[PDB]
Structure formats: C-alpha cells, structure tokens
Symmetry: C2
Subunit: 213 residues, 2 copies
C-alpha cells in the first residue's frame, strides 16, 4: 500500500544486531536479517530477533538458490515472516519455497540478480509470488550514474505484472520522487536508518513517501 520503511541488519554478530534492532524498532516497519548476519550467526539470529520484536515484519535474507523446501522451513520455523529467494533459483526451487510459505503463513521475495528476464518474472507471478527486491543496477552504481531510465522502466514493467517492489540501493529522501506510480512494498536501507540520526532520516523518508503514495 503506502511503501514501508525496512532496515537490513548486516552486523557480523548477534549482540550488536540485537542492540540495533532494539534501537530502531520504534520507527522501522520491517527488520531484515541480512545474509551476512544469517551466515555469521545462523537461524539463532532470526529467533532472537523474532522474540525481541514480536510485532515487526521479520525478513530472513538467504537469497536461496537451491535446497529451498528445507531452507524455507528452517527460516519460517525460526520466526521469519518473509524470506528472499534468488532469481537464479530454478523455478522448481522457487515453487518449493512458495509451497512452504503458503503452509506457514509467510511470503517469498525474489532477489533480482543474474541474467534474469521478464519471462522469469511472469513465472514468479504465476506461482502467486507478488514481491521482488529491485537493486539499483551495479553498473550504474560503479559508473556513478545514479538511477537510469532503464532501471525505472524495468521497475514499471515489473509493477505492471503485479510485482510489488522493495526498492534499495543508496535510497535517500531526495530519490523517492523517482518511483512515483511504481507499486512499492518497501524502501530498504541499512545503518543510515540506525544509530543516532536514523530516526530523522526515516521521518524524512516517510515525509516523501506520503507525497507519492
């Protein structure tokens, strides 16, 4: 609906992450266990956060590429509401993750990486998947060229298929206007939503979200 504010926790230990979750909980809608924290600490991270923050949407960012039935179940059982699955997973793996999600009252989000196509995106939607994470393209980022027409058009196409995007990649309040008319579930950021000025920046993000949704 109105895009939510999501923090990606990418700490390399649970103690630190637990202290950040505990800090930002009051002004963040979605807390994500990032893949760096997932691989540092394992599903204990997801558990501990789920118990600390029973009322937040909790994401486990595994970027699952294979072994989906098993991984999905582990993450949901540990307490995740949403899990991420790589666009590069075979469609049978994606379907296996979505089957577990539908059984456990969770959702799948496709992390868009690799040589992905619009046909792939339609396959996701055909499984009933309605979420995908769109990252500002790595080429653009490296060239310092910002958000390109190409990206915004791809996002609009994804949107026209029924995918609700989570938008990420240096997102700042001045960029928000760029995505008006794109179906957007969340804007994601890491620690620029954390610490002492995280609050201010979040109010600032929301202020701009309200204008365009």
């Amino acid at each position: 609906t109105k895009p939510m504010i999501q923090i990606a926790l990418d700490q390399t230990n649970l103690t630190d992450a637990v202290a950040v979750a505990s800090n930002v909980a009051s002004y963040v809608d979605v807390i994500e266990v990032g893949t760096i924290l997932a691989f540092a600490e394992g599903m204990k991270a997801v558990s501990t956060l789920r118990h600390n923050h029973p009322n937040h949407i909790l994401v486990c960012d595994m970027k699952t590429t294979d072994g989906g039935a098993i991984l999905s179940r582990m993450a949901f059982e540990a307490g995740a509401d949403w899990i991420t699955v790589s666009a590069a997973a075979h469609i049978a793996t994606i379907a296996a993750c979505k089957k577990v999600a539908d059984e456990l009252n969770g959702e799948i989000q496709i992390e868009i990486y690799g040589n992905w196509t619009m046909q792939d995106a339609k396959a996701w939607v055909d499984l009933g998947i309605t979420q995908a994470i769109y990252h500002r393209s790595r080429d653009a980022e490296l060239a310092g060229i910002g958000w390109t027409t190409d990206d915004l058009d791809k996002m609009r196409q994804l949107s026209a298929l029924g995918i609700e995007l989570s938008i990420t990649g240096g997102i700042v309040p001045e960029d928000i206007y760029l995505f008006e008319g794109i179906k957007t579930k969340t804007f994601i950021a890491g620690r620029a939503l954390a610490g002492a000025e995280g609050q201010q920046t979040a109010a600032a993000l929301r202020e701009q979200i309200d204008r365009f949704w």
Copy 2:
C-alpha cells in the same frame, strides 16, 4: 590429478554434522559445509569443522550472490579453503571474492545456476577462477531422465575453457564412466557417503574414477 571425493554436509544442526564428518573423515578428501548447515549454525560450523579436521580441504557453500568481500573474508577467516559464489553474482562481486581469496590463500568456486552463459564462464576464467560446480540438470531430474548429452556437452565446453568441474547430482559408481575426459576436480555426494554403507560407496566410486583418470 585424479578427481577427489567430496561430501556435502546438509545436516540441520552442528552436533549431527560433527558426528558425520568424524565418521567419513578417513575416506573423504573434501568436507563441505553445505548452505543448509551454514544457515542453520553459521560460521561456528566452519571453524568447528576446521578444528576437528585440520588436514582436509574444507569448503563453505554460501552460493554468494552479493556482499562478496565481507562474506568471503568471514568464510576464510573461519577456516574455509574454498568457498562457493553463485553464477548470478555480478562480475564485480565475483572479482571482490576472488581478491579476498587471493589475499587469504583460498579459492573460489562458481555454483552454476540461473540463466548462465559460456560468456559468463569465460568472464570467470579471465578473473583467474578455474573451479565450477556443475549440477545435473534439474529439468532432467524432475522428468526422471538421467545425465543428458546436452549436460555432458556443456561440461566438455566448460572443461575446454580451462574450468575444472566438481560434478554432483545423484552421482553413483555406475555413472562415473559418463564423465571420462572432463577436467574434474571432485565428485560431490551427500549422506550416501555417510552411515554404515558410506565407506563402501566411496571405495566403489574411487574404483570407477581410477578406471577413467588420469
């Protein structure tokens, strides 16, 4: 040299993984911490297994898609010799992993998934990466068809580019002959290499590998 025997540990807790590693150590060359174990237990799985088995090649199977510099350094610091990176990782991420690997004297292995191409495979080789993991085609598995000619053709092309493949997906002694003449670093299997019949299975695989390599 000859293809080695690798076990992929996919236990969902560390205690069971440690018991399996302990039981197969003397007849398996490479121990891999599979993504299932890595997500279950985190890097404590890698450092525990590195401590229990200081003389084995240890793999951390992360299928890295992003955050490569950070994840790679974590894995190597934990004791991994080889780590896996997804074919879907952007080339700049792949390069960032390979840089950390070179600094820490480890290696990168490309997990072949997604809409991958021979151009992509040449890009990996250009970075000095010479290992990739080739899984039996999922389409073929689902259809009840074995190893297809299209798979074997693709593996021979990858080999010709200079990639040493690790081959996996229901590998049994009976199929070993199929891969003659492919540059093969390892064959990877899971719990079939463990338990009461694991040792025999491994001997049966080595007996076939010896017929066809080097």
